[PDB]
Amino acid sequence: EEPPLLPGENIKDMAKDVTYICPFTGAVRGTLTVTNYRLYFKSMERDPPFVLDASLGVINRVEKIGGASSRGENSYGLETVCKDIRNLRFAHKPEGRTRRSIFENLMKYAFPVSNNLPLFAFEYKEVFPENGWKLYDPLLEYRRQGIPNESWRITKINERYELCDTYPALLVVPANIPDEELKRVASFRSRGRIPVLSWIHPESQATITRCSQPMVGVSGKRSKEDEKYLQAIMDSNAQSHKIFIFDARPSVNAVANKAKGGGYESEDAYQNAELVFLDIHNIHVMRESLRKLKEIVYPNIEETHWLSNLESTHWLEHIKLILAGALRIADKVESGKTSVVVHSSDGWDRTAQLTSLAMLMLDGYYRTIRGFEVLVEKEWLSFGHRFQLRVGHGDKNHADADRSPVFLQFIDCVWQMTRQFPTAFEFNEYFLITILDHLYSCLFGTFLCNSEQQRGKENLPKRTVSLWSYINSQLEDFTNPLYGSYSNHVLYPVASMRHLELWVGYYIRWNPR
Amino acid sequence: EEPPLLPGENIKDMAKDVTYICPFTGAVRGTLTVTNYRLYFKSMERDPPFVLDASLGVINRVEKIGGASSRGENSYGLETVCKDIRNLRFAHKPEGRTRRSIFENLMKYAFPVSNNLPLFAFEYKEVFPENGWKLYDPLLEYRRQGIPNESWRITKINERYELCDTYPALLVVPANIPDEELKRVASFRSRGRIPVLSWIHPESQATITRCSQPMVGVSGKRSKEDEKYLQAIMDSNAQSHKIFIFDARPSVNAVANKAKGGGYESEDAYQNAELVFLDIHNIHVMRESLRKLKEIVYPNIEETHWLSNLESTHWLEHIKLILAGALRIADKVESGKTSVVVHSSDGWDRTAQLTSLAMLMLDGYYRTIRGFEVLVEKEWLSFGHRFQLRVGHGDKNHADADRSPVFLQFIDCVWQMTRQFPTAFEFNEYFLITILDHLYSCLFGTFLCNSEQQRGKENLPKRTVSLWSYINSQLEDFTNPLYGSYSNHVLYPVASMRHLELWVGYYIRWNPR
């Protein structure tokens, strides 16, 4: 059957009497359509119409199955490997070009930028009553936190992104540190990500700052600017006697980075700091972890070795390390009243997961729907997470090792927190799954590019629809009705294999049971 | 401090200033009291009075630590291995006229059966608003099921236990089958446990009968009355097409028995019967499962390999098979409208788990607190599960290979069902745990002996108190607040490693969470 279209979506090819092999109900013949935004398959050979509708941004690779003409053993079709742990395999008649027409159209529209075609986000013409692009206001958010205040000021040194071009235009830093000082410190921090304020505690004034690793190198070089800058941070919390520095990386990996120019803060160079390593592994390791998981989760789960197979993926283990690390940060801020500086190698994948999760534990604001969108806009988009590079929108280059489920891990961690606190979040599971779906969809421009400055040059607000514009128009589908019972208090989920669950709602949502 | 003694409980020994080394908190000195029913330890050295109550009946083994020459920090004293997945270690003064005393008095009252001392069950003299021994009435129960009737009659042939000394005094058998033949059939079934009615469906008249394995042997011999027996059970159902015989043993097993004089019902000899194997292992295989489970759970849990270690015990795998097995039987009765016959080697272990479990699925009556109690008294107690032998009340022989957690296993399954159906049961977790607690406590006579006949020869109903007499006094602590939500209908739990959980409430309840 025909697929429903969206403002800007037009059919690019169609083939009828195509057979999709469902690993759960068997073969089903019907029509396969490929618009400039999705892959649609519907069959009227089933009482409820069997509809398969997946966006093209989800397609990771396309592969042919069988060979040429009809040499294959009853298998002339193609298969699509999807980012959301499905794989879709289709069959084609002996007599038919539909096998090559579809393949060639998928391998063109599912990968627009690799064929100098535009991503759908730029074609989508649907309008909304609210502009998601105007949801996050740096100045208003800081004000919500009490910023500018005697201890912290707001600098505009980065409005044209000269200090650091992967950072937001506005940066909050200690009031006693001048702009000429930020330059020097920027010379010591990788890619100019010089610690900057993320969150400040209402009462204690304890702060969460984020930045990249120090450039120490093998010769063990050091800078007074950076060292005093870190001190200025601790001085802004008056009643504290220390400053913790959480390094997301495992100790053995930080050392390796040191050998290549990076490193960490030593107990001697930073007198009043205590650096902890949280043992959270790099992007490549998480890609492999998720890959092993998809392997035992789709399409059929083998019961006997489920537990060991699951453990072997190290998915839940990584989630646990992320949550636990977030827990250590939020605790030192809450209970210890001590400011914490959090970083990693570049400070834009693990640091983002840590600050984001701690913030959610500490501030109930980000647990509300609009709050979370702000959280996503603040930590991850504005602070330079490479969504484009990490997801690979419309790029045939599926093996790229720059691709990793970083954000997906974060969202998983959030879902983990919502299970443990069924009343503390205004949003619900569907909201989160909807976010993961549009991470790949490229329907909106919210998860495009790799930086704030990039999005400015690309003029994304004026050329694409924000994902929040659509979500804030259907809020009845994203609200947790049990939201309230808890309160405007601090959350402390339990990181332990006995309280973390596999997010069945996402990683196994295709099995019709 | 001293223990709060129960009606009939006397202090057999006391020593003060003893050290308890808690595998979770530090050492605690205090007073270790021993009575004729429990082991009580209490210390006022902790904001919350650290209490350590435990029935002697839950003491699996007592062994002395140190004696010759060992003066260290808590390396002198005694240790107790318990049956409720924990271990107690007391550092009791090396000198002070207390070199040898506490140990001796623990040993004496912890194993009354071996020492030839009364079980505290006979010295307990608390009274309760109702007597649990009256709770279950064989005739009042069959009447609830609509028995007797045109098709099934109640025979008295075994009133003196002369047909089967394990079996209850009243037996429900096919109306047409006279008592004389019950004898001939009794000689074909192992230990004379002839197929007897356990449950019947109100609408389809599909029954569920239980028995021990057939006595076929290598000589493939067969009973003319047996076959005819099963024929009447089928004929009672309106002659429905055919009749399933569920053997709880794996195929290999039944065959093993065959060569031993036992076996199972063959095609041609039982022409109208489908024989299925549920692949549930024997007592030794189970005890070993539970043994590996207490080793990775107590005292400290190694997180890195929790999933693997848990998979290695195969506890969840056995719970699956057992539940899975009840699902088939329940389904063949609910859906196929077919009478089934469940049996095993002796027909008092796996048969009890299966009928009890299927019955819970089919009849909501057993889902009520009183109904469940009746279930235990009927399917487990009157039908001869060897709780004295399987649990070994007050017996110094801990290596006995006759001991197996067959009943606990059953209770574990039920807990699984209260988890998958949080509203269908009137009783709550605590209730089920209390039941496990008095399985070892021997505070009541409810779980003593091996059969109904023995319990009578000891006159338990008049010399000991029934557990239900206690439980039904506080039904507010044992009630499920959510119960009622659903209707009286058939519960179908999922028997998958993806749905079953590890009862942390009973297998890891000691840790301070």
What gap in Å lies between CA A58 and CA A392, rounded to an integer? Answer: 10
**Chain centroid offset of residue B262 CA:** 25
Task: Please choose, from the candidates B180, B228, B236, the residue with its C-alpha nearest in 3D space to the C-alpha of residue B206.
Answer: B236
Q: Are A154 and A172 in contact (CB under 8 A)?
A: yes
Q: Which of B441, B423, B399 is nearest to B482 (CA)?
A: B423
- Residues A344, A359: Cα–Cα separation, whole Å: 17
Which residues from chain B sit within 8 angstroms of residue A303, using beta carbons?
320, 496-498
Q: How far is A497 from chain B (nearest CA, A)?
A: 7
Q: Give the strand pairing for A340-344 and A207-212.
A: parallel
Nearest to B457 by CA among B376, B356, B408, B388: B388
Q: Is the peptide bond before A3 cis (omega within 30 degrees of 0)?
A: no
* CB of B124 closer than 8 Å to CB of B71: no
CA–CA dist B142, A469 (Å, integer): 65
Alpha-carbon span A351 to A212, nearest angstrom: 8
CA atoms of A12 and A377, how far apart (whole Å) = 34
**Euclidean distance between CA atoms A332 and B125, whole angstroms:** 55
CA nearest neighbour of B440 among B380, B390, B372: B390
- Of B307, B316, B320, nearest to A311 by CB-CB distance is B307
b/e sequence B144-162, b meaning 16+ C-beta within 10 Å: ebebbeebbbbbebbeebe
The residues pairing with B344 across neighbouring beta strands, listed in sequence order, are B212
Tally of CB atoms within 10 A around A232:
18
How far is it, in rounded angstroms, from Cα A316 to Cα A310?
Answer: 8
Residues B272, B276, B280, CA angle at the centre, nearest 5°? 150
Pick the CATH number of A10-110 from 3.10.20.340, 3.40.50.720, 2.30.29.30, 3.90.650.10: 2.30.29.30
Count CB-CB contacts under 10 A for residue B428: 19
Question: What is the C-alpha to C-alpha distance for residues B95 and B101, in angstroms, rounded to an integer?
Answer: 11
Amino acid at A323: L
In chain A, which residues fall in CATH 2.30.29.30? 10-110
Alpha helix segments (H runs only) across A177-305: 179-188, 224-236, 251-259, 283-297
Token pair for residue A483?
């939201």
The CA angle A13-A15-A18, to the nearest 5 degrees, is 145
Q: Which of A228, A152, A148, A245 is nearest to A184 (CA)?
A: A228
Taking Cα atoms as reference points, which of A406, A474, A465 lies closest to residue A434?
A: A474
Q: Report d(CA B288, CA B307) in Å as an integer.
A: 18
* The token pair that represents A201 in the structure block: 């505690």
- The Cα-based distances of A411 to A316, A416, B234 in angstroms read 13, 9, 57
CA distances from A496 to A137, A309, A318, B315, B484 (A): 36, 18, 11, 21, 33
Taking a C-beta distance cutoff of 8 angstroms, is the pair A134, A48 a contact?
A: no
Q: Are B497 and B317 in contact (CB under 8 A)?
A: yes
**Could you tell me the two tokens for B104?**
């001796």
Distance CA A404, CA B309 (A): 30
C-alpha B191/C-alpha B188 separation (Å) is: 9
Residues A369, A479: contact at Cβ < 8 Å?
yes
Longest dimension (CA), chain A: 80
Q: Are A9 and A37 in contact (CB under 8 A)?
A: yes
**Gap between the Cα atoms of B42 and B49, Å rounded:** 7
- Nearest-by-Cβ selection for B307 from A301, A304, A310: A310
Q: Which positions in chain B touch A307 (Cβ < 8 Å)?
A: 307-308, 310-311, 316, 497
> From which experimental method does this structure derive?
X-ray
Of A301, A311, A496, Cβ closest to residue B498:
A301
Nearest to B497 among A303, A497, A498 (CB): A303
For B355, other C-beta atoms within 10 Å of its C-beta total 28
The single-letter code of the amino acid at B383 is F
d(CA B244, CA B338): 7
Q: How far apart are CA B175 and CA B154, in angstroms?
A: 8
Contacts of B176 (CB under 8 A, 6+ apart): B232, B235
Spatial CA neighbour of A437 closest among A506, A512, A493, A368:
A506
Token representation of residue B142: 């069959």
State how far the alpha carbon of A340 is from the alpha carbons of A233, A247, A323, in Å.
9, 10, 16
Q: Helices A315-334 and A306-313, interaxial angle, to 10°?
A: 60
3-class DSSP state of A491: coil
Touching B: A residues 310-369, CB under 8 Å: 310-311, 316-317, 320
Do the Cβ atoms of A48 and A57 come closer than 8 Å? no
Taking each helix axis from N to C terminus, what angle separates A306-313 and A283-297, rounded to the nearest 10 degrees?
160
Q: How far is CA B52 from CA A396, B31, B41, B370, in A?
A: 65, 10, 5, 31
| Resolution rounded to one decimal, in angstroms | 2.6
CA end-to-end span of chain A:
25
Q: Which two tokens stand for residue B153?
A: 């009659």
User: Can you tell me the distance from the alpha carbon of A17 to that of A2, in angstroms, rounded to the nearest whole number?
Assistant: 13
Contact A306 B497 (CB under 8 A): yes
Contact A90, A84 (CB under 8 A): no
Chain A residue numbers touching B306 (CB-CB < 8 A): 311, 497-498
CB atoms within 10 A of CB A177: 20
Decide: B59 and B80 in contact? Cβ < 8 Å: yes
